[PDB]
Each structure stands twice: as C-alpha cells, then as structure tokens.
Design a protein around this ligand. Sequence first.
Ligand SMILES: CC(=O)c1c(C)[nH]c(C(=O)N[C@H]2CCCC[C@H]2n2cc(CO)nn2)c1C
Length: 106
Amino acid sequence: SMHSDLTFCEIILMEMESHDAAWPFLEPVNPRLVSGYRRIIKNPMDFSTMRHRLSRGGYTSSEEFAADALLVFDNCQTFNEDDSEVGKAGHIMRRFFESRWEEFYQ
Ligand SMILES: CC(=O)c1c(C)[nH]c(C(=O)N[C@H]2CCCC[C@H]2n2cc(CO)nn2)c1C
C-alpha cells in the first residue's frame, strides 16, 4: 500500500541520515563553495530535502522516493572522483541504500 511504502521510506531515510558515510549528503551542496556545482548538476538532491518532502506528503509512491535517493548518488558519481572522500562515501551510501531497499520491498 502507499502507507506501507511510505512507512518503509521513512525508516530507510532515518538509517541513511544516521550512517557514518552520510556526511556529504545531509544538506544541499552550497554552490558558493563548490565551483561548477550549480552549473553542472541540473537536479541537486540531498537527505534534508528528501526529509522535508517526505514529511509533507511530497512522495506519493516509494518509486519516486528512490528516484530522489538515486539522484543523490548519481550526482555524487558525476561530480566527484572515485578516490575522493565524497566520492567514496557516495559509493558506500549507494550500496547501503540498495541493500536496505531490497530488504524492505522485496
Ligand atoms: C561536490 C559534491 O558532490 C559534494 C557533496 C555531495 N557534498 C559535499 C560536501 O559536503 N562539501 C563540504 C566539504 C568542503 C566543501 C564544502 C562543504 N560544503 C558544505 C556545503 C553546505 O552544506 N556545501 N559544501 C560536496 C563537495
């Protein structure tokens, strides 16, 4: 149901927000500090924005919630080198998200 889908999304988001590797993703990237970011990344996303939307009925399906989570990790992979601290954290967080998603939904 939508209710169970969104209940599970909230649990997964809480686990992501609390994860050791979540530090790059808790708040929107500030374009004033990261040259190129606003110009290059057309669809920015972060966990605080997801929490705002989720808490206010912004997601009507769990598929759309996952689309925003994957945007966080796709943007990170686009912009950051794989060996960088942020890039490494993105790979860790994507693997964690995918594993938890399959537990709850499949
Ligand atoms: C480019 C990128 O993909 C990225 C992500 C997803 N995360 C961060 C990040 O955490 N960078 C901090 C370290 C030094 C630069 C600025 C810091 N910082 C804070 C804010 C606003 O919170 N924006 N950038 C980056 C740099």
